[PDB]
Amino acid sequence: TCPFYKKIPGTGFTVDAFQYGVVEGCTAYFLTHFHSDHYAGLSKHFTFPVYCSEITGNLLKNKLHVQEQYIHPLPLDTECIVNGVKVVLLDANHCPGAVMILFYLPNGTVILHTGDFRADPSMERSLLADQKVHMLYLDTTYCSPEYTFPSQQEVIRFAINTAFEAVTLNPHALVVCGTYSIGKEKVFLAIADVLGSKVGMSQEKYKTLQCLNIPEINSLITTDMCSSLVHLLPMMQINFKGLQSHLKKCGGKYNQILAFRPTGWTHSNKFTRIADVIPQTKGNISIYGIPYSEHSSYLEMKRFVQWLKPQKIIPTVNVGTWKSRSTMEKYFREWKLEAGY
Ligand code: NI
């Protein structure tokens, strides 16, 4: 049964709640983004109205075959009316098509649901600035002060410089990047751009990227692996065995692999700077784990909440253990005492 933190009080609405069958009293199902823990349950047989971004709606139609008549895409940064309630979709700085949802309840309460997000000071100048928010349904993935990571820009600088150096030293090196969901496209696109190559990938992944409205994409990606020196593989294949096997398939075109796994956080973050990151190596294969996050760090999250000053916070992540829940509630109280709301 649907958990309380997926239900929007005073409405007929749910958020990211497609795996519970027909939810009692739900008149409209919102979907924040196309990640499987959030869309789990949708298919061509779904016949209730789904509200989402344009990009999410492209993916529902093309990847999951949801019929068009049930997809209701909304423009961003625009006041819209859904079943008699004003809503706004805002960019969540997560993966392509990911949104936060502002709900303006008929009684005057204003609710922000962040979906999954990476907080940023740029959000302090969207339509959020214009009214008070009473209740915050918060992505608390990294809600603990151990979670520090660099900016996305520092991480991409590291990856570009590393790949450019390796391939200039050895023009027969292949670069491989792992993926298993949408998101983090900058990693492989920025490396292909510095090398003057397209990114090669499976037909299924090319299909997915073609749903994303990324400008000039026909210019950056391809299904012709033979013409590409940056390849995308499933995340599960980014290990020494999987990469040795791939290099065999390339027919002697290449004699070295440099591979990247964009993780979120890993405990090498508490001791080491990005500058100082080193790969795991075996023979002619090297693997870099790079801390490219699409969720808020602890300090990014804290700054957003201290700016927004909500009256009540409802966590949406790490809610399954009493120790997690108690930890998070203690931080929320600190933040409120330090800022004075
Ligand atoms: Ni997500």
Question: What is the distance in A from the centroid of ligand 1 to the CA of 131?
Answer: 27
Are 110 and 18 found together in one domain? yes
Are 205 and 134 found together in one domain? no
Are 269 and 288 found together in one domain? yes
Are 287 and 305 found together in one domain? no
Neighbour-count burial of 31, counting CB atoms closer than 10 A to its CB (0-12 exposed, 13-18 middle, 19+ buried)? buried
Structure-determination technique: X-ray
Question: What is the distance in A from the centroid of ligand 1 to the CA of 35?
Answer: 5
> Residue 59 in contact with residue 45, Cβ under 8 Å?
no
Nearest to 152 by CA among 200, 119, 181: 119
Question: What is the distance in A from the centroid of ligand 1 to the CA of 125?
Answer: 23
Are 67 and 154 found together in one domain? no
Question: What is the distance in A from the centroid of ligand 1 to the CA of 120?
Answer: 16
Question: What is the distance in A from the centroid of ligand 1 to the CA of 338?
Answer: 30
Are 286 and 327 found together in one domain? no
Are 291 and 301 found together in one domain? no
Resolution in A: 1.5
Question: What is the distance in A from the centroid of ligand 1 to the CA of 40?
Answer: 12
Nearest to 111 by CA among 18, 26, 29, 6: 6
Are 25 and 132 found together in one domain? yes
User: Backbone breaks in the chain (C–N > 2.5 Å) follow which residues?
Assistant: none
What region, left, alpha or beta, does residue 52 occupy, with left being phi > 0 and alpha being psi -120 to 50 degrees?
Answer: beta
Are 291 and 306 found together in one domain? no
Domain that holds residue 190: 148-295
Structural domains of the chain, count? 2
